[PDB]
Amino acid sequence: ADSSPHTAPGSAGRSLELGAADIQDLESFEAGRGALPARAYLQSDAPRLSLNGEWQFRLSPGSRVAPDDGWQLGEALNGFESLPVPSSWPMHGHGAPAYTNVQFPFAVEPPHVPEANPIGDHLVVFEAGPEFFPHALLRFDGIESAGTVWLNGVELGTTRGSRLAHEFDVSGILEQGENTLAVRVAQFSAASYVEDQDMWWLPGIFRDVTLQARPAAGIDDVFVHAGYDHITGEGILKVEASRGGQAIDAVVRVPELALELAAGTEVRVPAVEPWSAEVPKLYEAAVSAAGESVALQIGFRSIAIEDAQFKVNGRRILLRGVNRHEHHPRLGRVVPRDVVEAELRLMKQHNINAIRTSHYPPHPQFLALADQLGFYVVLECDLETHGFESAGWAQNPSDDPQWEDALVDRMRRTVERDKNHASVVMWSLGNQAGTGRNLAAMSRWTKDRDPSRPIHYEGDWSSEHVDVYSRMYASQAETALIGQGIEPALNDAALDARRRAMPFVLCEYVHAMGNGPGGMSEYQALFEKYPRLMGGFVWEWLEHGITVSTADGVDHYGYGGDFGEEVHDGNFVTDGLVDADRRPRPGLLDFKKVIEPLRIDVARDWTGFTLRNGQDFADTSAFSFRYEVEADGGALDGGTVDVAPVAPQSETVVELPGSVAALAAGLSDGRPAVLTVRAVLGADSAWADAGHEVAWGQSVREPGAPVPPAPVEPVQVQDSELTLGPVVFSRATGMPTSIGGVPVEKLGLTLWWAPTDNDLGREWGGADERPLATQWKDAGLNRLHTRLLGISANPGQDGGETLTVRTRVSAADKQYGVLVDYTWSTDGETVGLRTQVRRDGTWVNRGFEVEWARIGLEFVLGEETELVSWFGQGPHQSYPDTGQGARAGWFSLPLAKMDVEYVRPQECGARSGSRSAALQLGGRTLEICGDPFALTVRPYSQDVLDAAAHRPDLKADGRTYLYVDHALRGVGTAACGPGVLEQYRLKPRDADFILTLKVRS
Amino acid sequence: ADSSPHTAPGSAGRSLELGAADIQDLESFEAGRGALPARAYLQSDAPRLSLNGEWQFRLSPGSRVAPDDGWQLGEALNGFESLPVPSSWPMHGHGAPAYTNVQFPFAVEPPHVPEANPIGDHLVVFEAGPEFFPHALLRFDGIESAGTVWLNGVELGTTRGSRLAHEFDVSGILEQGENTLAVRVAQFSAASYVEDQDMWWLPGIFRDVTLQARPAAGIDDVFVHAGYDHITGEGILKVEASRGGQAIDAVVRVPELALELAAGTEVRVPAVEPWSAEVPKLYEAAVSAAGESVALQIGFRSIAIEDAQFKVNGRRILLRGVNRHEHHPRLGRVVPRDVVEAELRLMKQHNINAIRTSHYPPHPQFLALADQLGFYVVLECDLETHGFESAGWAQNPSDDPQWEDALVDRMRRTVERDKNHASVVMWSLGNQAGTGRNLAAMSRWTKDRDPSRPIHYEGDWSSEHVDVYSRMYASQAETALIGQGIEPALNDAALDARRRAMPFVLCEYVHAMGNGPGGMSEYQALFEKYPRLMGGFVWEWLEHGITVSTADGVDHYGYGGDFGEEVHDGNFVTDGLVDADRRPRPGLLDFKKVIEPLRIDVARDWTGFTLRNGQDFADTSAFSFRYEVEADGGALDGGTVDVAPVAPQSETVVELPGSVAALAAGLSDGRPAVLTVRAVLGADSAWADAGHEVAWGQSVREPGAPVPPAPVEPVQVQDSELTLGPVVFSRATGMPTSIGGVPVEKLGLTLWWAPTDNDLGREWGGADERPLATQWKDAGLNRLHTRLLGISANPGQDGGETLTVRTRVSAADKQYGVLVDYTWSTDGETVGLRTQVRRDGTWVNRGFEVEWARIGLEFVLGEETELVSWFGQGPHQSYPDTGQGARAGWFSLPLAKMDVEYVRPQECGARSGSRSAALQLGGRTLEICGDPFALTVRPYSQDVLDAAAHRPDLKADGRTYLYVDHALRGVGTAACGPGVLEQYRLKPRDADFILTLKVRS
Ligand code: NA
Ligand code: NA
Ligand code: NA
Ligand code: NA
Ligand code: NA
Ligand code: NA
Ligand code: NA
Ligand code: NA
Ligand code: NA
Ligand code: NA
Ligand code: NA
Ligand code: NA
C-alpha cells in the first residue's frame, strides 16, 4: 500500500473491507493447492461414478458479497436453483456470455481481479457405496477459472488452469452413504491473465466430475513409449507404470502382437504396422497390477526432424490442418460426445488430417477419437497472454518470475494427461504469450519429460526453445522464401543456424471469416513444392456463434456485443469453416478441394488422366475411380476404371475407356460437355461411407461465345416509351421497363458490393490503411448515381435499328465517373446488349486510387424468382480467389439456396465462371448468355444486405436483384492476414462486354 | 458525345430522350435572360402591388417528367395545390430539406445537373388596375436556383443567382384585369455549382414578388455618394439618377440640411453629423423627376485604408462582428420582418456592431435596418464553389472562362442593389470559391463601378485583387504575428508589399458550435492591441435548426441527416451563438462580454474604478454608471456615480462613494462580498430600453478556504456497513451509501465528459489527428472502473477516527491507472473529504499521451434535486476558456435551468469557479464547500448524455448526478479552427483536493 497516495500519522489500522481472504486467494500466483500429482487420463477397471447431472447453483456478483453462510453443508439452499453440470453457466441464463478477442475485459493490473466478478456456488449430494473405500479421489476435468472444492464441509483444495484436470484425495473424508460436494467457482482470477484466448469468456464446471475408487496395489500413471523403426519395420515398446510416485511391477499384454512383457522394459517388436493419420493402426493393450488394470490403445510411430523436415515414420508429412476450439451454440464450452464424433468425421470427409487444439487441451476423451480416426494433433497448453501486447508486453506473465510455478504446472498437467496418445505429434507451449523465461522453463520441462515429441511455440520468432519454426498468417510471399530457406537471418548466428535447420509450419493461416478465405491455392502450391514447409492449420474450424431468438422467435446466431458487453470484438468470433452447428461454409467446400490428397489431371482430348498420389503412406487402393460425361441433356457416359495402386508421392497415367474420347471427338463444335473423373471410397471407412468423394478432376468443352442477334427489328417510338422487339424502354431514363413481358424496375452499372468481413479489415502496408470498405464509403462507391446523356437509334440490318443509351455513373461530390453506353439489338426473339465503360477522370480519392468490387450490371426485376439455373461452376459460390470446390456443370437451385447464411450478412453467393443462366419468374424464364460472367440473384437489395447486422435484418421486397458481372475482385483474407493478392485485385479500367438475353414462356 | 465509348457506323441518329430542352437551359452558363438592367432597390411613389400570398404549386421529380401541359395558362390545375409564396417549398411538405457543408449533393461534372432534380411549378392569378399601364415590371427578389417566368403564356425570361433580384418588363403583356403569372423553378441548375454555401439546400420562390408601375418621366436607378471630410466636418454629396440607362435631370431635396440640388453634381455640405455603427445618423432625402420620386436615407461616411488600418471617418474602427445567414426554423430561407428586426436588436443588445452577409446578399429590406440600427456590413456576393476544393479545384468555375459572364453578373447585381446604403462598408466577392480569373474580373468590375468601398475576398491569400487581407480561423498565434506585421513573406515581392500594407480581418473565427467557443479572449486582446487587426466576425450568428416533432409530438430541432439525406454533414449546421428561434446560447453571453465597448477595472480596495472607452466615435454620455455591493444576505449598498464623459479611446479614474470602501474595510475576514460596477443605457435607444447593461466590472472579496472538521467522531463498525457521524459506508465497496440521510448510490472519480462538438473535431497538427472524443474512446476513458484496495480507520482527535478508502481507477485492457484515496472525517455535523490521486503507469495509448476532461468526483444520489444554489460565477455555464459573461455572485436555479439545450446533447452546464454549492433534495439540503471547483448537476447520467443525438433522447431516471471538479479542461473551437489552447489543456497529473460536506434539514 506504499504507492497509494495518502500518508496517515500513527500506526496502521485494521482492514475493514469484506471478502479480503477470498480475493487474496483469487489473486494468488500459485497453481492451486491440495491436488494429487498430475497424471494421464486412463481407462481403468477401478470403480467409477459420474457426478454429472442436476446440481444446485447460486450466483453472486463478486467475492465481497458472496455469502459465507455454511452453504457447503447443503442445509440452507433457499438462494440455489437447479443447474446441469457440466455447464458453462451463462449458457443457462446466469449472467451472459462475453466475447473479446485480444483485449482483456478487466483492467490490466496482474494479479488483481475486478470487483464485478461472478461467483458461482455449486452443490450436489451423492451416494458412495462400499467400493469407494478405503481410498477414492474426486476428478474435475475443467473449471473456468478458479475453483475451491469442499466435501462434507472439508476443504480439499483449489483448481487453476481452466481446461486442465485436477484430482483430490477424498480418503477419510468421503463417507459411506450420502456426501455433499460443494464447489465455489470464480469467473475471474489471476489465471484469467494467462487465459486470454480469442473466444467467449464462459465460467463454469464445464467438464466431467468423477468419483474414482483407488484400490490397493493399483496403477496411478502409465507412460506408453511406442516408436517405429522404418528401416526394419520393428516397433520399439516400453510401457512405464507407477503408483504413489514410484515405478511398479505391472504386466503389459498386447494380444494382437503376441506380447507379454514387464512394465518398465524396452523391447523390440519384430513387425508392427505403424500408426499415421492416413492409416491409424492401433493395438489394444492392457497394463495390469494386482489391484487394477488399465486399457490402452497403442499406435507405433516415431517423429523426427531431419534435413529441415518434419518426418513421421521416416517420411516427410503434409499437414492438412484446422484449429479446433471447443464450442457449442447452446452449451458453450460443453461439447457433447456425439457432436465431437460427428465433427471429426466431417473433418475427415473434407480431407483434413491434422488438428491444433487451439489454445488449450481438449476434453480428455478427444484424444482417443483422434487416435482412432487419424489426425496429427498439435496439443496446446492452456496459456495465452495476448492482451499484454498492447503495452509492449509490460508485466507479461510469461517473463515474470512470480508466474513460473503456475506456468510450469500448466505445461506439466497438459503433457501428463495426454502423453500416451499416438495422435499427439507436437506439444505446444501456448499461444500469443510473448517471449520470456517461463516459456523457456515450460519447454525445458517438456523436453526433459517427453523427448519423443517436438515442441511448438509461435510467439518467439527466434525459435530458441522450440523444434519447429512456426508462424501465423505469414504471406504467401514470405512462406515461399521460408520454404526455400532464404528468409533474412536472425541477428544471432547461432540461433539463425538452428532455425534454418527447422521445418516450418503455419499454425494459423487463411483466416476463414465470412466470405472467404481467398488465396488458399497459392499457399498449397508452396506446401507441396517445398519439403521444409510442413503445411498449415486453417483459422478456424468453427464459428463460435451462440443461438439467440428475436422478439418473434426467429433463431439466429449472436456474436460479440449481442450480450451487452461493454468491450467486445463483434463478429470476429464467427470466423470458421463451419457454423456453430457444424454446417459447412463455402470455405470448407473449397478447402476440401485445395487439400485433396490425389491430383487428377484430365487430358484435354479425354483419352485419360494423370494421377498423382499425394498421400504420405497409403497407396490408392482405398479408392474407386469413376468417370462421367455430362451434357445439357444429362449424362452421356460413365463408369469405373481400374487403377493399379499408385504408391505415395508417385504418379501414373490412366487411360480412360475409348467411348469417352470417341464422344469428345464426335461433339459438335460449341456444344458444351464436361468430363469428370472422381476418386471415391471403394468401401465404408470409419469416417464415411463407400462412394464418398475424396478427389476429382475435369476437362470441359466450353460452349461457343454468344451470337448477338441480327439487328433486324427497328425502334418504335411512342410518346413516353420506345419499343425494340421484346424490349420496352423509358424515354425518361433510357432503361428497359420490360423484357419479353418481365417487368424491369431498374438497370444500371455496378462497381461495389456489400463489404465482406475481409473488406472491413485493414490492409497493412502502404500509406493507406483504411479498410477497403471504408475506402469505398469515402469514395462514394456505395452511393453511385446515373445521369442520362442521350438516347438514339442507329441503322441496323434490313430496316432494323440498334438503340444506344449513353449514361454517366458517378457519386455525389466526386469528379471521377465512367461513361457507360448500352447498345441494344434484337431480331424479335433474342436481345443483344453491349455495354461499354470508359473512365472519365481519375478514380482517386483522398490521394489513393479507388479499387472496384466489380464491373457489372444490376437488373432489378419487378417479380420474384423461384428457381435459378446456370451452366458454369457450382453448386456453391465462387469468387476469383476462391471457388476451388465449385466444379464445372449444370446447376439449378431454388432462390433461397443461392444465398449463404453468414452470421453477419455480407456479399456472397456469386457464381463466377458462368456462361449461361436462366431465372424462372412465375410463368416466364429469363435467359442470359455471355462470355464468362459472375451470376448472383437475391430477393433484397445490396443496401439491405450491407445494412443487415444479423440474418433477421434481411427482408424480401417482392423483386429480384440480378447481378451479371463481367469482372469481380477476389475476397482475400484481410480480416486477419493477407488481403487480396495482386492478380485478383480489380483496378479501374475501360471495358466492354456483350450479353444476349431471351425470355421464353 | 465524342468521349462516350460507343462508335456507331453511319451518320448520327435523332435524340429520343425527353426533356432535352429544359435540361439544356438548366445547364446553361448564361446569367439568365430577358431581364431589365440590374439596379438599386429603391423606395418610390410609383404604384406597387405585392403578389405574395397563396399560389398554386405542383412538384415534379425532374425535368424529363415535368409536364408540358399548358399549365402556364392556368386552365388545367388538377395536379396543383395551395402553397404560400414567398416560400422555401420543402418547409411546406414538398420534398425535404437537405444539409451539406462542403460536399455537393450531386456528381461534380459542371455544368450538368442530376436526373433527380425537383421542379416546382408555381402559378398565381392577379388583377392589375389602370395604374399599371402603359408600363410596368415584375420583380423577383429571390428564386433558388433557376426560374423561368411566363405572364399570360408569354415567356418573360429566366433567373440565375438565387439570392439576387431580377426584373422583367411586362409592358404589352400585362393586361388590364386578370393576369396569370407562372414560374417553373428548378432546384438544381448550373448555378448550383456556384452556390455551395454551408447551409440547407432549399428551392423556392423565397422572397417577394412585386408588380411595379413604371410611370413616364420616372427614375429607374439612383447612386448616392455621401462622403465625410473629418478634417472640415463637411459632407461630400452627389446623387446620380438615371432612366432607361441615361443620366436624367432630377431634383434632390434634403430638408434637414437645407439642400436643394441637381442630381449628378457634387456639392460640399458645410457641416454634417457623420454616420457610424455607433451613431447611425441618417438624413431623409428625396430624388424627384416629373413622374416619380424616390425616398432615400443618406448617411455621410468615408472609408479609407491607410497605414495598414481600415478607417471610417478618419478613425480606425474595431469590428465586433457576426456572420448572418438567413434562416428560419419553420420557414427556411424566408425570414419574417419582425424576426429580422428583433434579431438585429438582439445583436445590438449583445454589443455587436458589424455583420457579414454570409454568403449572399440578404433580403433587400435588411439594408435599411442596418443603416438605421447601426452595423458595419460586409455585403457578400452570392458565390461559393467550395465543393471543388476536394479535387484540387479542378474545374472550378471561378477560373473557367465559360463562367465569366455569370460571375460578373452576380457581382453586378449584388453591387447595384445595395450601393446606396451607408452601412455597407465592404463588398465581398464571395466565399470559398478558390482563386481564378473570374474573381479578378468581379473585383475589377466592382472597383471601377464603386471605388468608395474596399473589396474583401478570403479565398486568395495573396490578396492580389482585394483591399484588405482576410483569413478565416487563423490561430491566435498567427493573428498575433499578422497584427505585428511579421508574418512570412509571399513569394512575389510586389504582392507581399501590397499585402503587408493591408489591414487584416478574420471574416470567420471562434466557431460557435455547441459548447463554446473557447479562446475568444485571446483573439480580443490582439484586436485591441494591434491597429492592423480590424477585428473579426464570429461563425455564426444562428443555428440553422429545423423544427421537427417526434412520434409523441415533442418539438425539437433537426439537423443534417434528419431528413433522409444520402449525403449530409450532420449537426454542423447547428453552429451558432443563438438557436434557430434566436434564443441565446451561452456563447453569445460570453461574446457580449468579450466585445464590450467599455473596460471597467474595479480597484481591489473598492475606492474606485478605471474606465476606458473602447468605442471609436461615441463618448460615454449614453451610459449610467451603477454600483452595487452584494453579500450572502443580499445587497448592502448601491447607487449611481456621475462620470464626466470619456472620449473614445480615452481612459479615466472614477472614484466611488466612500460608503463602498468603508464597507470593504469593515468586512470580517473570510466573509464573501462582491462589488459590481455596471454601465447601462441611461435612456431608451432604438435597440434596447433604459437600464440595458452594456459593460461591467467586479472586485470580489473571496470566502475563506473551507475548514475541515475536527475528526472527533469514531468509525462505528457493523457487519456490512461502517458509520462515521452522518456518513454510512458500504464495507463491500468503500463508498458512502448515505450522507445525513441523503441516499448515495455511487461515488467515484471522473476523468471524462460527454464529448462536445469541438471534441468531435480533428486537432490538426502533430502526429495524432484523432478527435479528442476518439482518443478518449480508444483510451477507455469513457468506461472507467474502480477496484477497491482497502478500507481502514486511523486515529483522529480525542477518540475520533478518520476513514481512508483506497481505490484504483482504470479501464478494461489498459495498464495505466490512478490510485485514488478518499479520507473522510467528521465532527458530527460537517464532513471532510480529502481526495488524493496518483498516476500508476503512464497514461499513453496508441503511442499518444491521453488527456483528461477533468479531475473530479461524481456523486449519484438516489433522490431528485429541485433547486441548485451556489456562490461562484453565473448564472450560465463556464469552462476554463469560456465563461467571460459569467460574473461573480450568488445564484439559484431550478434543476432544469442548469442544463443547456444544445441540439445534439453534449457536455455542458458546468459552473466553474464555485466556492460553495447547495442542492435541495426534497426536504434536505446538501451543502458542498471547496477551494474553487466546477459544479454540474443533472437528472441523467453521462452515458445518457453522450448517447443522445437529440434532446428527446434525454430521460430523467429519478436520481441526481452531481459533479464536483477540482480540474477541468477548456472546450476550444476544434470543430472548425483552433483546439484548446495549451494553458487550458488538462494533462494527466497527481493531485489532491479537499471538500467539506453538510446536510441540513
Ligand atoms: Na499438487
Ligand atoms: Na512440404
Ligand atoms: Na476470432
Ligand atoms: Na481396381
Ligand atoms: Na472452380
Ligand atoms: Na451487412
Ligand atoms: Na439583362
Ligand atoms: Na485593432
Ligand atoms: Na456550419
Ligand atoms: Na452623469
Ligand atoms: Na467568469
Ligand atoms: Na450526445
Side-chain angles (χ1 to χ4, degrees), chain A residues 679-703:
Chain A
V680 308
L681 294 182
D684 292 350
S685 75
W687 46 269
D689 290 339
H692 169 80
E693 184 183 65
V694 167
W696 56 267
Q698 297 179 308
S699 175
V700 179
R701 299 296 173 88
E702 300 285 0

Side-chain angles (χ1 to χ4, degrees), chain A residues 3 6 16 64 104 106 108-109 115 394-395 566 731 785 787-788 791 813-815 821 838, chain B residues 3 6 16-17 64 104 106 108-109 115 394-395 566 731 785 787-788 791 813-815 821 838:
Chain A
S3 55
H6 180 76
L16 297 170
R64 306 193 193 270
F104 283 112
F106 43 70
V108 185
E109 45 162 345
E115 298 298 321
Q395 309 188 251
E566 189 164 50
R731 292 182 67 178
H785 289 285
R787 187 173 60 85
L788 177 65
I791 304 166
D813 198 43
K814 305 306 179 177
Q815 290 195 18
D821 292 355
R838 176 175 272 162
Chain B
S3 55
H6 180 76
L16 297 170
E17 72 277 9
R64 306 193 193 270
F104 283 112
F106 43 70
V108 185
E109 45 162 345
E115 298 298 321
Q395 309 188 251
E566 189 164 50
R731 292 182 67 178
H785 289 285
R787 187 173 60 85
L788 177 65
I791 304 166
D813 198 43
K814 305 306 179 177
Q815 290 195 18
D821 292 355
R838 176 175 272 162

Side-chain angles (χ1 to χ4, degrees), chain B residues 18 59 143 240 379 431 481 483 498 552 604 663 846 943:
Chain B
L18 303 175
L59 179 64
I143 302 177
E240 296 176 306
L379 201 139
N431 185 61
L481 296 184
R498 295 180 183 274
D552 346 3
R604 317 322 282 270
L663 210 46
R846 293 201 180 188
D943 290 333

Side-chain angles (χ1 to χ4, degrees), chain B residues 600-929:
Chain B
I600 296 170
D601 285 325
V602 180
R604 317 322 282 270
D605 63 6
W606 291 20
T607 59
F609 58 99
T610 299
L611 169 62
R612 176 170 202 276
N613 180 2
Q615 300 169 108
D616 301 312
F617 304 105
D619 65 12
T620 53
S621 68
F623 308 113
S624 171
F625 292 86
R626 311 254 162 104
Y627 62 92
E628 178 163 273
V629 174
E630 186 175 0
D632 181 78
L636 299 179
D637 197 7
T640 61
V641 53
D642 173 40
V643 179
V646 180
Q649 301 300 303
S650 294
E651 184 174 351
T652 195
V653 176
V654 180
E655 189 176 333
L656 284 166
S659 59
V660 174
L663 210 46
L667 288 174
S668 305
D669 313 337
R671 182 189 182 194
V674 177
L675 166 62
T676 303
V677 175
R678 306 158 65 218
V680 308
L681 294 182
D684 292 350
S685 75
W687 46 269
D689 290 339
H692 169 80
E693 184 183 65
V694 167
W696 56 267
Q698 297 179 308
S699 175
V700 179
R701 299 296 173 88
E702 300 285 0
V707 177
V712 297
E713 300 287 21
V715 171
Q716 308 160 250
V717 181
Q718 287 174 332
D719 283 333
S720 58
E721 296 172 332
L722 311 176
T723 304
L724 182 55
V727 191
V728 177
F729 303 84
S730 166
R731 292 182 67 178
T733 72
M735 304 182 290
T737 53
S738 65
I739 299 174
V742 179
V744 179
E745 308 297 293
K746 273 188 67 174
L747 171 65
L749 192 79
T750 58
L751 304 173
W752 173 87
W753 70 30
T756 70
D757 293 321
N758 287 327
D759 301 327
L760 295 166
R762 318 199 73 109
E763 181 65 11
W764 306 98
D768 195 5
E769 292 186 5
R770 293 170 302 158
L772 183 58
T774 299
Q775 299 174 33
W776 283 339
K777 278 190 290 177
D778 292 349
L781 213 68
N782 66 320
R783 48 176 175 86
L784 300 176
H785 289 285
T786 304
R787 187 173 60 85
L788 177 65
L789 307 222
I791 304 166
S792 68
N794 296 324
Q797 170 180 329
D798 302 327
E801 303 175 291
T802 61
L803 186 77
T804 296
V805 179
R806 300 182 305 110
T807 74
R808 189 176 182 277
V809 177
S810 185
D813 198 43
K814 305 306 179 177
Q815 290 195 18
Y816 44 80
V818 286
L819 298 161
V820 185
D821 292 355
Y822 304 94
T823 300
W824 300 86
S825 60
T826 187
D827 61 2
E829 179 178 30
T830 303
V831 177
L833 175 57
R834 184 188 196 197
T835 304
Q836 284 170 112
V837 179
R838 176 175 272 162
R839 296 159 299 150
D840 175 31
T842 303
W843 282 70
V844 59
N845 186 67
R846 293 201 180 188
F848 294 102
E849 307 211 317
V850 179
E851 296 197 18
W852 292 342
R854 71 217 300 172
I855 304 169
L857 303 177
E858 178 191 53
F859 296 77
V860 183
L861 314 173
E863 296 187 353
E864 294 170 342
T865 292
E866 326 289 321
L867 187 79
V868 182
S869 300
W870 73 102
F871 178 75
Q873 310 286 314
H876 64 278
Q877 64 176 21
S878 60
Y879 290 77
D881 58 350
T882 62
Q884 301 90 328
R887 73 190 67 198
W890 293 259
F891 305 94
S892 190
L893 288 172
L895 178 59
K897 290 188 172 182
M898 297 291 292
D899 211 344
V900 185
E901 298 199 9
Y902 293 122
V903 178
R904 185 188 74 86
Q906 62 194 263
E907 167 62 21
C908 65
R911 271 63 178 186
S912 293
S914 303
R915 299 301 312 276
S916 60
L919 279 69
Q920 183 174 319
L921 305 115
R924 295 189 155 96
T925 300
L926 169 63
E927 298 181 344
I928 303 111
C929 293

Side-chain angles (χ1 to χ4, degrees), chain B residues 104-128:
Chain B
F104 283 112
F106 43 70
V108 185
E109 45 162 345
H112 300 293
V113 294
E115 298 298 321
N117 182 14
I119 305 302
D121 293 334
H122 299 66
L123 191 141
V124 66
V125 175
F126 66 98
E127 313 244 15

Side-chain angles (χ1 to χ4, degrees), chain B residues 519-640:
Chain B
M520 288 190 282
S521 297
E522 285 78 12
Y523 283 108
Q524 199 64 24
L526 301 170
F527 295 160
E528 281 276 6
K529 187 188 301 193
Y530 292 119
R532 185 187 185 198
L533 299 183
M534 299 165 50
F537 298 76
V538 178
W539 190 273
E540 60 177 310
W541 171 239
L542 44 68
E543 296 180 347
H544 309 213
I546 288 178
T547 304
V548 295
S549 69
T550 58
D552 346 3
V554 179
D555 280 5
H556 64 100
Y557 293 121
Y559 48 70
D562 290 335
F563 300 91
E565 298 100 307
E566 189 164 50
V567 304
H568 66 83
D569 290 278
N571 77 322
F572 209 64
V573 85
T574 54
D575 59 356
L577 296 168
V578 303
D579 74 13
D581 276 284
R582 278 63 173 184
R583 295 181 288 241
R585 296 305 189 202
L588 182 61
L589 308 184
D590 289 341
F591 185 56
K592 176 180 182 186
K593 169 65 173 180
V594 168
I595 61 165
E596 66 188 351
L598 309 175
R599 186 189 72 205
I600 296 170
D601 285 325
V602 180
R604 317 322 282 270
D605 63 6
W606 291 20
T607 59
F609 58 99
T610 299
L611 169 62
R612 176 170 202 276
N613 180 2
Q615 300 169 108
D616 301 312
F617 304 105
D619 65 12
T620 53
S621 68
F623 308 113
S624 171
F625 292 86
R626 311 254 162 104
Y627 62 92
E628 178 163 273
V629 174
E630 186 175 0
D632 181 78
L636 299 179
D637 197 7
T640 61

Side-chain angles (χ1 to χ4, degrees), chain A residues 335-567:
Chain A
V335 188
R337 181 179 175 81
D338 61 326
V339 170
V340 181
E341 296 177 331
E343 80 176 345
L344 297 177
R345 290 193 300 270
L346 193 66
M347 290 183 192
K348 299 288 288 185
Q349 285 169 20
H350 291 80
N351 290 329
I352 290 155
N353 71 6
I355 297 165
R356 174 167 175 238
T357 68
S358 47
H359 303 289
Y360 43 76
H363 189 284
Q365 287 188 72
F366 173 90
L367 283 296
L369 294 169
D371 289 346
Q372 288 160 11
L373 294 171
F375 300 91
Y376 305 114
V377 177
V378 180
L379 201 139
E380 192 152 271
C381 181
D382 195 347
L383 171 64
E384 174 152 359
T385 60
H386 200 180
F388 285 89
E389 185 171 26
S390 57
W393 299 101
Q395 309 188 251
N396 182 13
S398 305
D399 198 43
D400 179 343
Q402 297 205 276
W403 284 94
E404 186 181 323
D405 288 338
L407 265 54
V408 170
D409 189 75
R410 286 166 179 268
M411 194 71 202
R412 171 171 57 234
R413 292 187 186 279
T414 293
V415 168
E416 294 298 341
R417 201 192 66 186
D418 294 342
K419 60 180 176 280
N420 297 326
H421 290 283
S423 61
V424 179
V425 300
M426 260 176 297
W427 297 117
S428 180
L429 305 180
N431 185 61
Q432 299 254 48
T435 299
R437 57 180 290 169
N438 297 332
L439 287 157
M442 297 163 77
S443 174
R444 286 194 295 267
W445 186 95
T446 301
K447 187 56 68 177
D448 173 77
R449 178 67 173 129
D450 182 19
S452 77
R453 299 169 166 104
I455 297 172
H456 169 278
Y457 178 61
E458 175 281 343
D460 168 22
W461 291 10
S462 79
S463 304
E464 183 172 16
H465 299 114
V466 297
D467 300 314
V468 304
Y469 178 20
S470 182
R471 289 282 297 289
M472 55 173 70
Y473 312 107
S475 65
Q476 293 92 335
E478 187 174 6
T479 297
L481 296 184
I482 296 169
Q484 297 170 269
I486 64 183
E487 72 275 17
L490 295 170
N491 293 328
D492 181 311
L495 295 187
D496 186 67
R498 295 180 183 274
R499 193 180 71 172
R500 284 204 199 266
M502 290 180 193
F504 178 75
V505 63
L506 291 167
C507 61
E508 312 181 13
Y509 89 120
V510 314
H511 196 259
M513 184 179 182
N515 186 347
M520 288 190 282
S521 297
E522 285 78 12
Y523 283 108
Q524 199 64 24
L526 301 170
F527 295 160
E528 281 276 6
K529 187 188 301 193
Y530 292 119
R532 185 187 185 198
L533 299 183
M534 299 165 50
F537 298 76
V538 178
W539 190 273
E540 60 177 310
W541 171 239
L542 44 68
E543 296 180 347
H544 309 213
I546 288 178
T547 304
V548 295
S549 69
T550 58
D552 346 3
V554 179
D555 280 5
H556 64 100
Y557 293 121
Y559 48 70
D562 290 335
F563 300 91
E565 298 100 307
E566 189 164 50
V567 304

Side-chain angles (χ1 to χ4, degrees), chain A residues 50-293:
Chain A
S50 179
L51 303 181
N52 301 352
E54 176 180 276
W55 296 29
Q56 297 300 304
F57 174 83
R58 172 182 66 184
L59 179 64
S60 307
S63 298
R64 306 193 193 270
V65 298
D68 176 17
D69 55 355
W71 63 275
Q72 296 91 333
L73 274 36
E75 308 298 354
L77 306 185
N78 268 287
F80 287 71
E81 66 188 275
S82 67
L83 176 80
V85 170
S87 59
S88 299
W89 72 62
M91 304 304 294
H92 303 264
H94 306 287
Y99 168 55
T100 73
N101 175 4
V102 183
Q103 59 194 325
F104 283 112
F106 43 70
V108 185
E109 45 162 345
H112 300 293
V113 294
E115 298 298 321
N117 182 14
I119 305 302
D121 293 334
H122 299 66
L123 191 141
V124 66
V125 175
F126 66 98
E127 313 244 15
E131 66 273 22
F132 295 100
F133 302 88
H135 300 290
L137 61 76
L138 276 168
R139 182 183 176 93
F140 299 88
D141 274 295
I143 302 177
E144 178 167 324
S145 74
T148 303
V149 182
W150 298 264
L151 180 64
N152 301 322
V154 72
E155 183 173 312
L156 302 186
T158 59
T159 63
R160 301 288 189 274
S162 293
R163 280 59 66 148
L164 310 181
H166 298 76
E167 296 177 320
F168 300 93
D169 187 3
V170 298
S171 310
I173 296 161
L174 188 78
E175 307 180 5
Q176 204 158 330
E178 276 195 1
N179 289 266
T180 301
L181 173 60
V183 185
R184 169 162 286 177
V185 182
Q187 175 164 15
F188 297 125
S189 66
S192 302
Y193 285 106
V194 298
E195 293 181 1
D196 190 29
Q197 291 88 348
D198 171 21
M199 68 186 190
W200 295 95
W201 300 92
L202 293 172
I205 304 186
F206 70 95
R207 297 185 182 148
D208 298 311
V209 178
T210 307
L211 183 72
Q212 187 187 40
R214 309 307 303 128
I219 299 169
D220 287 326
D221 207 5
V222 176
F223 195 167
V224 171
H225 308 270
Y228 179 71
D229 181 336
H230 58 282
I231 302 299
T232 63
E234 291 171 292
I236 302 88
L237 181 69
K238 174 164 70 174
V239 180
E240 296 176 306
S242 65
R243 175 177 57 237
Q246 297 299 323
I248 54 163
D249 295 319
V251 181
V252 182
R253 299 185 177 91
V254 190
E256 179 174 358
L257 291 169
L259 300 182
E260 179 175 300
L261 71 157
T265 66
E266 182 178 281
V267 300
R268 309 193 67 81
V269 188
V272 308
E273 298 177 16
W275 186 98
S276 65
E278 296 172 8
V279 185
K281 176 71 177 177
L282 297 166
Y283 296 90
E284 299 298 317
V287 191
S288 302
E292 194 169 5
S293 183

